Structure formats: C-alpha cells, structure tokens
RNA sequence: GCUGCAGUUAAAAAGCUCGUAGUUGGAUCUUGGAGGGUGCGCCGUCCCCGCCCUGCCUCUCGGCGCCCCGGGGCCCGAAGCGUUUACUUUGAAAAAAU
C-alpha cells in the first residue's frame, strides 16, 4: 500500500497508490513479476504539457536505477497504457550539496562529490529525462535578452520512444531547474 | 609541444563523446575485472592491459564499462608496482643508454641524449614525490638505478 | 574564408574531411567489426587499427596483422561494423 | 603554453570583426569568458553566441555584427581601488561617455559602470568599446 | 619524558609547594607535585598535554610564568634545531607602485616552544603569540599548532 | 620609456640546449512599489535603497524548549566562531604647520 512503496521519508498517497497498485497489476505475471519486485519508488510528482496532457515523474533511490534501466522501456509502455493520458518517465533522486561559502560558515564539512554538484545533477536530469538514446551533444544559446537557452542534441536510433515525449522533457526540465530546454537530431559520421 | 625537441607533433587518442555504450557491449564489469587482474598477473603493464583488452577482446576503454581506470584495478587488487609505469620505462631507457655509454665513451651523442632522458626523469620524480606516490627523499641514482629497473 | 559559413552547423562532408582534433566538437575517426573464418561460426569484436596480433576465441589463426594504421584484415575473412 | 583563455578568446573575437568576419569559434571557453561575453551582449557589442560541449572545456560560437571597435584584455588582474578606476577608464576609453572597462569584483564579473552604481571594487578584466 | 630535573638545578614551579608527609597509601601522596596552570587567553585551548605534564618550562605559556600580549601571528615552521625553541618563516607581499608588483618578502622569527606541544616538525604551521622578551632573540611563544598531515604530499595518520 | 622604448639591417637576441632559484600556469564544484537628496509651475522629472514582476550549529555555556526513568537524553539575544588567505568594501585609530 501507501507504507511500502510510496516511503522514502512519507507515507503519500493518492498517485504514488494508483501507480504502485499498477505496478502490483504488473507483478501478477510471470518474468513480469520477480525482476520487478526488488524495484522501489520514493515519490511521484504530476506535472503538465501546455495544451494540457499531465507528465507523471517518478523518483528512484539512485542506486536502484540500473534495474529500472533493465526494464524501463517494458515498463513505461505499461505504464503509459494503463495509466493513459500521461508522459511516465524516471528519474532519479540525487542529493545535491551547496558550494561552501567562506562564512558558509565552513567546519570544513566534508569535501562534497562532483558527484553532488548542482550542475552535475542537473546534467543527470537531463541524462535522465531521455532515455535508451543518448545526448550526442550540447550547446548553449545566449538569447539577445540574456536568457539562455540548451540545446541537447540526440541520437537517431530508438528514439521513437521519446520522439512523442520532447515537449513534456521541456517542461518537467524547467519544473526543476527553470531552465529552457531544446531538442534536436543530427548527422552521421562519414 | 613536446617538451625535450622542436617537435610539434599533434597527435592523439580522439576520444569519444557519447556518454554511455558501447551498447552492442554486453560482458560485464566482472568479466573485464577478472580480465584486467589475470593479464597483470602475467606481469603485464595498465597500457599493455589497455592495449591488448581494447584489440584482441571489446574494451574500448576500461574506464567505461567500469567506472575505474586499470591502475587504480591494479592497485586495489594488489597488483601496483614500486613505481609508476613511466618512471620505470624512463629510468630503464636511462639505464639501456648509460650501458650504451660506457661500452662507447666516444659518442657524444649519446652524452647529450642521457642528460635529456636524466632531466625527464628527475622532473617526473619530483612531481610524484611531491604527490605522495613517491617517499619524500626518492631519487634516482645512475649507481643504484641499474639495480633496481630489474 | 569569405565572411560566409555557419560554424555552429557545418557540413558533414567537410566536417568528415577534417582532423579528428579539429572537429566541430572532437570526436574519432576509428571503428570496431565482427570477423568470421568459416571453420569457427562463432565471431570476435576487433578495433579497426589495433597494434595487437589479433587471434580468434580457440583456432591459432591470425584475424589481421597490425599497422602504421588500420589493421589489414587476413585473406579469407568477413566484417560487419557495427553499432550506434 | 596557456596562461589565459580568455587573452584568446577577445583576440580571435578582433580578429574576426577586422577580417569582416560574423561569427567565430572561440576554445576553449570557462565562466569568465561567458560571462565577459554576457557584459558584451547586454550592451550590443555582439550578437548572440552559443556554448557548444564536447566533452573537454567547451567550444563557442559568436555571432558579431559590428560595431565593435575593439574588445582587449588586461593583463595581469591589477587590483583597483574605486579611484582607479576613474584612472583605467580614461587610460583605455575612446570618450568619456562610452565604452566599457569590465572588472570582477567580489559582486560579480561586471562593466565599470555597474561598479560605480553598486559601489563595489576589485580587479580589472578588460574592456571594450 | 626523561628526568627532567635533568640539570644541576632542581626544577621546579615557584610558589607551589609541597608538603609530602606521613601515613600509608601514596605513600606519602600519589601525585607527589600540585601542578599549576592558567590558559592563555584569546581562546587558545590549554592543551592537556601542559596539564598532564611533568616538564617545567617557565617559558611555557601554560604552565610558566609569561604572558601572552601584543601581536598574535602565524606563521611555518623552518627549523627545529634548538633545543626548545624554533624558527618559522613569515611570508608577506611588499607592495611597490612606483610602478605596480609588489614582490614576495619574508622574515624569519625566532619563537619558544614549550614541551606541551610536540610533533613540532618543520613544515608545520603555527601559531605564535607576542610575549615578554624571553631571550635576546625571542619575542613569541607557540600558542597552537595548526598542523596538517595534509598537504597530503605524503599520507598521514590517525 | 609602470602607464609608455628599441633590439633583421640604425647603438642592442648569448653558438646551442639542459636546468635550480625566480617568475608563470587549462577546463570544472550556487541556480512596478514606495524612503531620501534639486529643478520646473497640488502635480511630477532625474539618482539612491530593501523587493518583487544564500552562515551553519549550539538550542566550555545558556536555555527558546521536546520526549524519559536526583539521575537522563535531545535540542531574539547570547554563544559556539570562524577553513586558511590575499584582495576589495565599510568603520575606527589616524600631530600641528604644510
């Protein structure tokens, strides 16, 4: 129910139950259950797409995500078909830690990992908002007024499966960073 | 570019973006582990593990179907020798050369190009010694180098 | 150089003409293949220059001979490339 | 070898507008030079340029229109005191009304002007006009 | 430790007497000498060292007979040649405009180092703190010893 | 000749390289609304400021207080207090004559 799945720190409900209860209607089933199991979910957060189809985002415990990576694509077909009218995606919950200042104070606390950098993370997001892809590439568009604007480039191959999704990936990104996202397709090397 | 020469030569691994694959890779960091710890038992090199994994069997780097490089596999395995792999092969360049040198006093050449090789290495030791790898008095010693690349 | 190019989107042809180093953003120039010899059915990954003897998973055969660059495949044998 | 990246960046960038160039690729690009090229852009000296990421440092590209006579670099960082910073203007500014020094002060990379405004001090990056 | 008493002397903390006397256990008395210190001031923790200790060093800022006033300063640790005493070297930046670099200057100073602190190893850093004229040469007296196995250059442990 | 010199031929790059001091060092770790100065005849124009369209912890100590059986644990000012600096910024301390 609500205690095992939806925990990570909070009970919580409503989504995190439907979605879990799918995943139990999954479980029944056959490789289709055993291989999920083990797979766990913090939280689920429902975010929208401009003419108004919702983007559901579920988080993972990080060190889970190679499983989820195992399934996915099975998965979210699943998820996308049962729970119809919404992008699904993954993403992981990763912890981030502050750049000390100074008078941050500073007990020296701990070094930190590049491996918790804000900028790090927020690469891990995007890594993570594709999927079976790839990034190919970045760029970085500096608009006349000041904004800022990525472009993350994009395999060819697979894609299909996010072709559909672009401009939820769009908002669900700027959700978190407030960012501005965009996508593209390349070339192939000759 | 280049350091003892007028050389200029660019040249270069291109290493590759894509963050992930190789994809048409299956194995497993266990199977180029176990790879890794076998070949370095045989006595051989992180370059020539590097080398031979890339050719003979799919590792286009060690690196990314385990996120560790083959020295650190080494080292903690257990396999890391006394000194660091270009340290070696400089002093025993030195070595073959101040060998070369004494069978024949009349090349000066010879002189010349040992003074390189010595700076070269005395340089390296020095960043390494300065990086904890080495002991803080490690040096290298024409008297006592010989003895110790083999 | 006449005021004219798009140096953020240039042509693949020209992009695929110039150094490994300096590519629009790098990247490599080099590739890997499966390789045959019909007497095995079985087929080994080989990087496309390789320095390396390369020799099959049990015959002592060869599977190419190295070079100044790309390695030269042995006689009677087969390749595809080939992945993302 | 490399001492500054940014001495490049600026130099490839004057080469470009004299050659009569409208675009450039800089490398290998670090915060400071987006951000000197961001004090640019806020005031029209160029266009708008793009980050581009291979997996090393990265590599941008400008596009330039042209009404920029000159952007330098200087080298080293020299320290300035708020009433030197009077005395950089003038040193390297064609009129007292226009062009920029651009500094880093503990506030941020930013044009002299904005220094004055904030009233904050620090060492001196470049310029440009 | 080693006798210290070593000298011809008997050393010992003024003003802090005995008085051992009879009866059993101890025996006599177990410590055998009341120890007297104060903490410096300016927050410097009194190492426990100074009060554990059975050296005597009036020098000491602890456990002697000096005070700690005037300018508190940092600085490394170049020799620890004499016995007691050190010799660290300050770096400081001189500023020349006439036209504008100022070029690193240093100065070394001599400074007291009581036998509470120890490890005292050149490379150290540390922090010494003004005081009455000790000696012809020495002004300052070790306060703490900043440290690091860092500087890692080498791996330290504990 | 810092700012702000010249050195192929004018006065001036050591025959060449190694090299310690010294100097010099890649990318990369946080993302209108009103207060006060002087112009113009109750109205406004034009600066300047905190904002909209990121010091932790304590909770040797003290207690704001939360839970346990004299024993405990935990946990605005003050305190703990600084990771080191350089830098720059705001203050004081800054002889009169000049």
């Given at each position: 129910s609500?205690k095992?799945?939806?925990p990570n720190?909070?009970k919580?409900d409503?989504?995190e139950s439907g979605?879990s209860?799918a995943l139990?209607?999954?479980e029944?089933?056959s490789?289709?259950?055993?291989?999920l199991?083990?797979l766990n979910?913090?939280?689920?957060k429902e975010?929208?797409?401009?003419?108004?189809?919702?983007?559901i985002?579920?988080?993972?415990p990080?060190?889970?995500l190679?499983?989820?990576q195992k399934?996915?694509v099975?998965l979210?077909?699943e998820?996308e078909?049962?729970?119809?009218?919404?992008?699904?995606?993954?993403?992981a919950?990763?912890?981030?830690?502050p750049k000390?200042?100074?008078?941050?104070?500073?007990?020296?606390?701990?070094?930190?990992?590049?491996?918790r950098?804000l900028?790090?993370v927020h690469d891990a997001?995007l890594?993570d908002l594709?999927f079976?892809?790839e990034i190919?590439?970045?760029?970085?568009?500096v608009?006349?007024?000041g904004?800022?604007?990525?472009?993350?480039?994009?395999?060819?191959?697979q894609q299909?499966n996010?072709?559909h999704?672009?401009?939820?990936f769009?908002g669900?990104?700027?959700?978190?960073?407030?960012?501005?996202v965009?996508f593209?397709?390349?070339?192939?090397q000759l | 570019?280049?350091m003892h020469?007028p050389?200029?030569?660019?040249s270069?691994?291109?290493?590759?973006?894509?963050?992930?694959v190789?994809?048409?890779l299956?194995l497993?960091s266990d199977?180029?582990?176990?790879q890794?710890y076998?070949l370095?038992?045989?006595?051989?090199?992180?370059?020539?593990?590097?080398?031979i994994?890339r050719?003979?069997?799919?590792?286009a780097?060690v690196?990314?179907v385990?996120?560790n490089?083959?020295?650190?596999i080494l080292?903690?395995?257990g396999?890391?020798?006394?000194?660091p792999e270009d340290l070696?092969?400089?002093?025993?360049?030195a070595?073959?050369?101040?060998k070369?040198?004494?069978?024949?006093?009349?090349d000066?050449?010879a002189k010349f190009?040992?003074?390189?090789?010595?700076?070269?290495?005395?340089?390296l030791?020095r960043?390494?010694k300065?990086?904890?790898?080495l002991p803080?008095?490690?040096?290298?010693?024409?008297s006592?180098?010989?003895?110790?690349?083999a | 150089?006449?005021?004219?190019?798009?140096l953020?989107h240039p042509?693949?042809?020209?992009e695929?003409?110039?150094?490994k180093?300096?590519?629009?953003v790098?990247?490599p120039?080099?590739?890997f293949?499966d390789?045959?010899?019909?007497?095995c059915?079985k087929?080994?990954?080989?990087f496309?220059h390789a320095?390396t003897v390369?020799?099959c998973?049990?015959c002592?055969?060869?599977?190419?001979?190295?070079?100044?660059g790309?390695?030269r495949?042995?006689?009677?044998?087969?390749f595809?490339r080939?992945?993302? | 070898?490399?001492?500054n990246?940014?001495?490049?960046?600026?130099?490839?960038?004057?080469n470009?507008?004299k050659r009569?160039?409208?675009?450039?690729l800089?490398?290998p690009?670090?915060?400071?030079?987006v951000?000197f090229?961001?004090?640019?852009?806020k005031?029209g000296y160029?266009g708008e340029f793009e980050?581009?990421?291979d997996?090393?440092?990265?590599?941008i590209?400008?596009?330039?229109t042209?009404r920029?006579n000159?952007?330098g670099?200087?080298?080293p960082?020299?320290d300035?005191?708020?009433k030197?910073?009077?005395?950089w203007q003038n040193?390297?500014?064609?009129?007292?009304?226009?062009?920029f020094?651009v500094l880093?002060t503990?506030?941020?990379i930013?044009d002299?002007?904005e220094?004055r405004?904030?009233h904050?001090?620090?060492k001196?990056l470049?310029f440009?006009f | 430790?080693?006798?210290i008493?070593?000298e011809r002397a008997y050393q010992?903390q003024?003003?802090?007497?005995?008085?051992?006397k009879r009866?059993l256990?101890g025996?006599?008395?177990?410590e055998?000498?009341?120890?007297?210190?104060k903490?410096?001031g300016l927050?410097?923790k009194?190492?426990?060292?100074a009060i554990?200790?059975?050296?005597?060093d009036?020098?000491?800022?602890?456990?002697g007979?000096?005070s700690?006033?005037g300018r508190i300063?940092?600085?490394?640790?170049?020799?620890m040649?004499?016995?007691?005493?050190?010799?660290?070297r300050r770096?400081y930046?001189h500023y020349?405009?006439?036209?504008?670099?100022?070029?690193?200057?240093?100065?070394?100073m001599?400074?007291?180092?009581?036998?509470?602190?120890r490890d005292?190893?050149?490379?150290?850093?540390?922090?010494?703190?003004?005081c009455?004229?000790?000696?012809?040469t020495?002004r300052?007296?070790v306060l703490?010893?900043?440290k690091?196995?860092?500087?890692?250059?080498?791996?330290?442990?504990?």
């Amino acid at each position: 129910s609500a205690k095992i799945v939806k925990p990570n720190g909070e009970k919580p409900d409503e989504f995190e139950s439907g979605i879990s209860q799918a995943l139990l209607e999954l479980e029944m089933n056959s490789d289709l259950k055993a291989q999920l199991r083990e797979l766990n979910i913090t939280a689920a957060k429902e975010i929208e797409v401009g003419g108004g189809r919702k983007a559901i985002i579920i988080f993972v415990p990080v060190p889970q995500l190679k499983s989820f990576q195992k399934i996915q694509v099975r998965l979210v077909r699943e998820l996308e078909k049962k729970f119809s009218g919404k992008h699904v995606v993954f993403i992981a919950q990763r912890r981030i830690l502050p750049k000390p200042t100074r008078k941050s104070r500073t007990k020296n606390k701990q070094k930190r990992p590049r491996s918790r950098t804000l900028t790090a993370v927020h690469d891990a997001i995007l890594e993570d908002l594709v999927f079976p892809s790839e990034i190919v590439g970045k760029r970085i568009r500096v608009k006349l007024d000041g904004s800022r604007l990525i472009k993350v480039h994009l395999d060819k191959a697979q894609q299909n499966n996010v072709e559909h999704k672009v401009e939820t990936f769009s908002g669900v990104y700027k959700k978190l960073t407030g960012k501005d996202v965009n996508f593209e397709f390349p070339e192939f090397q000759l | 570019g280049r350091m003892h020469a007028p050389g200029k030569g660019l040249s270069q691994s291109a290493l590759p973006y894509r963050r992930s694959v190789p994809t048409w890779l299956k194995l497993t960091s266990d199977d180029v582990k176990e790879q890794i710890y076998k070949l370095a038992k045989k006595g051989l090199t992180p370059s020539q593990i590097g080398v031979i994994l890339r050719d003979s069997h799919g590792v286009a780097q060690v690196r990314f179907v385990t996120g560790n490089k083959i020295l650190r596999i080494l080292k903690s395995k257990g396999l890391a020798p006394d000194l660091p792999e270009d340290l070696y092969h400089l002093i025993k360049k030195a070595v073959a050369v101040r060998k070369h040198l004494e069978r024949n006093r009349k090349d000066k050449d010879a002189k010349f190009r040992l003074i390189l090789i010595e700076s070269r290495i005395h340089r390296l030791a020095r960043y390494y010694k300065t990086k904890r790898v080495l002991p803080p008095n490690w040096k290298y010693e024409s008297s006592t180098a010989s003895a110790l690349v083999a | 150089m006449p005021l004219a190019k798009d140096l953020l989107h240039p042509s693949p042809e020209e992009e695929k003409r110039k150094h490994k180093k300096k590519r629009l953003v790098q990247s490599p120039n080099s590739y890997f293949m499966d390789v045959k010899c019909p007497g095995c059915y079985k087929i080994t990954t080989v990087f496309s220059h390789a320095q390396t003897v390369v020799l099959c998973v049990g015959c002592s055969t060869v599977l190419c001979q190295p070079t100044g660059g790309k390695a030269r495949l042995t006689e009677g044998c087969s390749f595809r490339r080939k992945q993302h | 070898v490399r001492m500054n990246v940014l001495a490049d960046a600026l130099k490839s960038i004057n080469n470009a507008e004299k050659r009569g160039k409208r675009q450039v690729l800089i490398r290998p690009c670090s915060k400071v030079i987006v951000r000197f090229l961001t004090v640019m852009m806020k005031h029209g000296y160029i266009g708008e340029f793009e980050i581009i990421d291979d997996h090393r440092a990265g590599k941008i590209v400008v596009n330039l229109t042209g009404r920029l006579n000159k952007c330098g670099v200087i080298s080293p960082r020299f320290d300035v005191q708020l009433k030197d910073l009077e005395k950089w203007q003038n040193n390297l500014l064609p009129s007292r009304q226009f062009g920029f020094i651009v500094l880093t002060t503990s506030a941020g990379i930013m044009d002299h002007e904005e220094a004055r405004r904030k009233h904050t001090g620090g060492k001196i990056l470049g310029f440009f006009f | 430790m080693a006798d210290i008493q070593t000298e011809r002397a008997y050393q010992k903390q003024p003003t802090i007497f005995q008085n051992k006397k009879r009866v059993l256990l101890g025996e006599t008395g177990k410590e055998k000498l009341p120890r007297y210190y104060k903490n410096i001031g300016l927050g410097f923790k009194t190492p426990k060292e100074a009060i554990e200790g059975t050296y005597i060093d009036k020098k000491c800022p602890f456990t002697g007979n000096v005070s700690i006033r005037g300018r508190i300063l940092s600085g490394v640790v170049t020799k620890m040649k004499m016995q007691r005493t050190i010799v660290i070297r300050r770096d400081y930046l001189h500023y020349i405009r006439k036209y504008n670099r100022f070029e690193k200057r240093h100065k070394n100073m001599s400074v007291h180092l009581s036998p509470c602190f120890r490890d005292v190893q050149i490379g150290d850093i540390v922090t010494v703190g003004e005081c009455r004229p000790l000696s012809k040469t020495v002004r300052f007296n070790v306060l703490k010893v900043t440290k690091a196995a860092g500087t890692k250059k080498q791996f330290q442990k504990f």
